[PDB]
Design a protein around this ligand. Structure first.
Ligand code: BG6
Ligand code: ALF
Ligand code: MG
Ligand code: MG
Length: 218
């Protein structure tokens, strides 16, 4: 049986993927780049703060100074951090709190595999910190999503092999990172966005311990 579940945060635990999209789109438009729509944003889900800004600049074949790049990333983060101040336990996605409780009752380890430097603050806002056996620090890994490093680090932090873990993700980059770690991915979203080659569920109510067992067994 699987021995750990490795959680993405934004778009899996709560609706902060929407917040990141709105913030990046506002930033892009301030600098005169209008291509950041929902379809383009599928390429930004899972990707780090600096990598996201670079993808937006590259979309428009735009170059900025190193000083301006740093300011833009900070500006977006400052806006996003203001956006999330009122996040609360009421914003936890359907199924997620009960899943965490059921995993702990069954002695299955729980680790955060998020790229977000705002992850710890968000888990505290949602009264979820006490469910987590480890939080992988994204500043410590040498490579970010779609590289598998963050999922590998999360598994190691709870003493479990990636091959005996399930990863939960809403992003193209993150699904690839789970695949390359050795863990089993279960995606949440549209197969049109996430692929027809892994198990995908339409919303997080589907993330029950019963279903995770169903998928693991086959
Ligand atoms: O800017 P932060 O809080 O470090 O977040 C980094 C990344 O975290 C990931 O979880 C999101 O899917 C990305 O959209 C985001 O860019
Ligand atoms: F949406 Al994440 F790390 F929380 F990619
Ligand atoms: Mg996500
Ligand atoms: Mg604790």
């Amino acid at each position: 049986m699987f021995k750990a579940v490795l959680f993405d945060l934004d778009g899996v635990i709560t609706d902060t993927a929407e917040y990141h999209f709105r913030a990046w789109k506002a930033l892009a438009e301030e600098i005169g780049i209008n291509g950041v729509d929902r379809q383009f944003n599928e390429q930004l889900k899972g990707v780090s703060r600096e990598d996201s800004l670079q993808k937006i600049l590259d979309l428009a074949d735009k170059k900025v100074s190193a000083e301006e790049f740093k300011e833009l990333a900070k500006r977006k983060n400052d806006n996003y951090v203001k956006m999330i101040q009122d996040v609360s336990p009421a914003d936890v996605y359907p199924g997620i709190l009960q899943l965490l409780k059921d995993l702990r009752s069954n002695k299955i380890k729980i680790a955060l595999a998020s790229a977000s430097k705002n992850g710890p603050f968000l888990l505290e806002r949602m009264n979820l910190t006490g469910y987590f056996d480890a939080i992988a620090d994204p500043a410590e890994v040498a490579a970010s999503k779609p590289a598998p490093d963050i999922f590998i680090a999360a598994a190691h932090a709870v003493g479990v092999a990636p091959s005996e873990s399930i990863g939960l993700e809403d992003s193209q980059a993150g699904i690839q990172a789970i695949k390359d770690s050795g863990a089993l991915p279960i995606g949440v979203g549209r197969p049109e966005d996430l692929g027809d080659d892994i198990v995908i569920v339409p919303d997080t109510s589907h993330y029950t311990l019963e279903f995770l067992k169903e998928v693991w067994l086959q």
